[PDB]
């Protein structure tokens, strides 16, 4: 039979592929570039806009816009280009012929689902569609029916308690620090060493520095005193032009903002104390099963030592005889996609799709009626 497409609109990356695949066939940054300079050479072959790896390759010439920030689609004309590029160029598949499983972060604006459906049925004429909560898929991806999923993307972080396959929608925490606010903080702290990264293309050097060289301290004050007292933590990297830059105690300081959002001037508590405050909203019979099965998800949880720092600092909060366990599979970057791939292949799921007949009858509001 025709497979469903499985597609995840991260803030940072698009992951897309076919249901039943073990890993996504297309991954590329969900970025749209436009040329910002005078076109001197006649006959070069101009282009109105680049997408994905094309916009990465040219990025010295381009202004780069992200069309999703904080999991909200903030201009639709770019996002529709990104989907057009996903179906026609990266997967090379007719969207006429396959169901599409989309994905969304919880508690985000209602209009985002209406539009995200309308564009699938009017523009792409997809046969049938669904929209699934990110943190729900990471349980399919990690072989579990019970857990509290901490999921952190480029744009949003959220906790979703799930016990025995029931979600607890009053206990869902959403927190708005993510890889992009780590990157913008990392530029500000890098300024302390004189390195200044200014433009949208130059930000995405800093993003690669963050990915390669950041790690989370297991005691922030002890490693602060160490790296203030020793070169041993100081490490160095080449910019694209071959300039070398050298990065010390600062490389742990930026992911520490996940645990102390006051560095960014954010109100809230960090991901650990929002995890514990999420478990404290659940019924007392299930907390013992939510103290195990803490599932890490999404790229912002890929930092070395973040699982150990989580286990340590939840263990400082939870009662002394609850077994705290953090579960962090090495593929957790893709776990939302893997869980979408599992979900879209179940036969019990094939009744769940929103078919075009139903959208024609009801209009886009149906997506709230026939879905979580």
């Amino acid at each position: 039979e025709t497979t469903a497409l499985v597609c995840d609109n991260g803030s940072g990356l698009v992951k897309a592929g076919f249901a039943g695949d073990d890993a996504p066939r297309a991954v590329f940054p969900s970025i749209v570039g436009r040329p910002r300079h005078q076109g001197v050479m006649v006959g070069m072959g101009q282009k109105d806009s680049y997408v994905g790896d094309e916009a990465q390759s040219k990025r010295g010439i381009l202004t780069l816009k992200y069309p999703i920030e904080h999991g909200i689609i903030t201009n639709w004309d770019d996002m529709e280009k990104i989907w057009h590029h996903t179906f026609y160029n990266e997967l090379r598949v007719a969207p006429e012929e396959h169901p599409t499983l989309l994905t969304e972060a919880p508690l985000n604006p209602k209009a985002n689902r209406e539009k995200m459906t309308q564009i699938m049925f009017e523009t792409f004429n997809v046969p049938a569609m669904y929209v699934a909560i990110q943190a729900v898929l990471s349980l399919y991806a990690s072989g579990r029916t019970t857990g509290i999923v901490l999921d952190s993307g480029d744009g949003v972080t959220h906790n979703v308690p799930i016990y025995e396959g029931y979600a607890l929608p009053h206990a869902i925490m959403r927190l708005d620090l993510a890889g992009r606010d780590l990157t913008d903080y990392l530029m500000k702290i890098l300024t302390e060493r004189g390195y200044s990264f200014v433009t949208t293309a130059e930000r995405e050097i800093v993003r690669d520095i963050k990915e390669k060289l950041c790690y989370v301290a297991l005691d922030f004050e002890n490693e602060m005193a160490t790296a203030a007292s020793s070169s041993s933590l100081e490490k160095s990297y080449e910019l694209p032009d071959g300039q070398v830059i050298t990065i010390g105690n600062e490389r742990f300081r930026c992911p520490e903002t996940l645990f102390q959002p006051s560095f960014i001037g954010m109100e809230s508590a960090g991901i650990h104390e929002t995890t514990y405050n999420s478990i404290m909203k659940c019924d007392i019979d299930i907390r013992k099963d939510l103290y195990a099965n803490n599932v890490m998800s999404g790229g912002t949880t890929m930092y070395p030592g973040i699982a150990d720092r989580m286990q340590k600092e939840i263990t400082a909060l939870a009662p002394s005889t609850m077994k705290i366990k953090i579960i962090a599979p090495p593929e957790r970057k893709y776990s939302v996609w893997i869980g979408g791939s599992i979900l879209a292949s179940l036969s019990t799921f094939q009744q769940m799709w929103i078919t075009k007949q139903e959208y024609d009858e009801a209009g886009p509001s149906i997506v709230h009626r026939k879905c979580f």
Binding site: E69, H70, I72, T74, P109, D176
Partner: peptide, 7 residues
Amino acid sequence: WXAXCPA
């Protein structure tokens, strides 16, 4: 968003 944040 529409209020408490830029998106």
